[PDB]
Design a protein around this nucleic acid. Structure first.
Ligand SMILES: [K+]
Ligand SMILES: [K+]
Ligand SMILES: [Mg+2]
Ligand SMILES: [Mg+2]
Ligand SMILES: [Mg+2]
Ligand SMILES: [Mg+2]
Ligand SMILES: [Mg+2]
Ligand SMILES: [Mg+2]
Ligand SMILES: [Mg+2]
Ligand SMILES: [Mg+2]
Ligand SMILES: [Mg+2]
Ligand SMILES: [Mg+2]
Ligand SMILES: [Mg+2]
Length: 59
RNA sequence: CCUAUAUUCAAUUACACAACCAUGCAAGAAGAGACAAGUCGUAACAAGGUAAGCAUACUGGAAAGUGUGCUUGGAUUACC
């Protein structure tokens, strides 16, 4: 079923450790899927992008 | 009633009678604790950058802010 509906991918910053170790890691995997979409010839549409203070992605 | 002995007895009345408390459930309200790292600010510990704090009053998103009196669980480094 489905497989022909646009899918929204949401990434956040896990709350398990202090610092930016989790926030910085969020940026890397977010760009992983963005480059992956080009490999699969998909279409990427940015909806929300909130950078963190210490060079990261809050959500 | 010349030895002797037989028989009966009841429940009513005036008024109170779920107030009351226990247990269980509930439309819903409020508090406390928890890890965790999110948003907002930096109150406290150094004269914490306005010395802190108690009683009480008033005020503000939030720590708290300010007045009056009191405490040193602050200092004035000591022929200055
Ligand atoms: K103060
Ligand atoms: K002090
Ligand atoms: Mg922290
Ligand atoms: Mg000073
Ligand atoms: Mg301070
Ligand atoms: Mg200040
Ligand atoms: Mg102060
Ligand atoms: Mg004071
Ligand atoms: Mg007071
Ligand atoms: Mg004032
Ligand atoms: Mg005062
Ligand atoms: Mg004034
Ligand atoms: Mg001395």
């Amino acid at each position: 079923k489905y497989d022909k509906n646009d899918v929204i991918l949401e990434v956040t910053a896990g709350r398990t450790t202090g610092g930016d170790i989790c926030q910085q890691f969020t940026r890397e995997i977010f760009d992983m899927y963005q480059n992956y979409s080009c490999y699969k010839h998909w279409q990427f549409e940015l909806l929300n992008y909130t950078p963190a203070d210490y060079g990261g992605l809050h959500h």
